[PDB]
Write a protein that binds this ligand. Sequence first.
Ligand SMILES: Nc1ncnc2c1ncn2[C@@H]1O[C@H](COP(=O)(O)OP(=O)(O)OC[C@H]2O[C@@H](O)[C@H](O)[C@@H]2O)[C@@H](O)[C@H]1O
Length: 170
Amino acid sequence: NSFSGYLKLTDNVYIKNADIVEEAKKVKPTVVVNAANVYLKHGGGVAGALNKATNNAMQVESDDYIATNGPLKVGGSCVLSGHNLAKHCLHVVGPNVNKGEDIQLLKSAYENFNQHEVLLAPLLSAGIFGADPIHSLRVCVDTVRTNVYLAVFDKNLYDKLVSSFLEMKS
Ligand SMILES: Nc1ncnc2c1ncn2[C@@H]1O[C@H](COP(=O)(O)OP(=O)(O)OC[C@H]2O[C@@H](O)[C@H](O)[C@@H]2O)[C@@H](O)[C@H]1O
């Protein structure tokens, strides 16, 4: 946990414009969050990017987990190996609002973060799943009480997130 270059938004939320995988390799974090689906299929996005960097070790361990325990709940989580990227990997499932999943569960999904004192995380539901990233950052800041280090990959999205957060801040 040697996080460098993060802007601090609140007492426990930090943000940085980085690739979450490059971040993980460099910082070797205790916990890296994966933006997961219910069957733990890491195709594309953060999940696929992380899986590739373990040369598909993650996807194999994931598939064994689903086979034993069945799908995760939307808004739920499971802790697996972090492989070469971290000690552990917390797969957290946020609502796919694009497919009509309840946006309320984004808050339950962020509540999983509070079981770890330090995390390297992306924004849940803010890509393929279609939530407003500003909304997702807002619920993260309102929900997570532990120290979360957000890697936002796209520069324009990151700029807009730090702007909007600080304009609406109180
Ligand atoms: N390499 C990356 N590094 C950092 N942030 C990233 C990266 N790739 C995407 N992001 C950002 O992380 C946030 C989450 O994007 P997704 O990974 O698409 O997350 P989510 O919306 O929860 O999508 C879940 C779905 O995506 C699939 O990969 C996954 O298997 C599941 O089906 C968004 O802001 C997105 O721009």
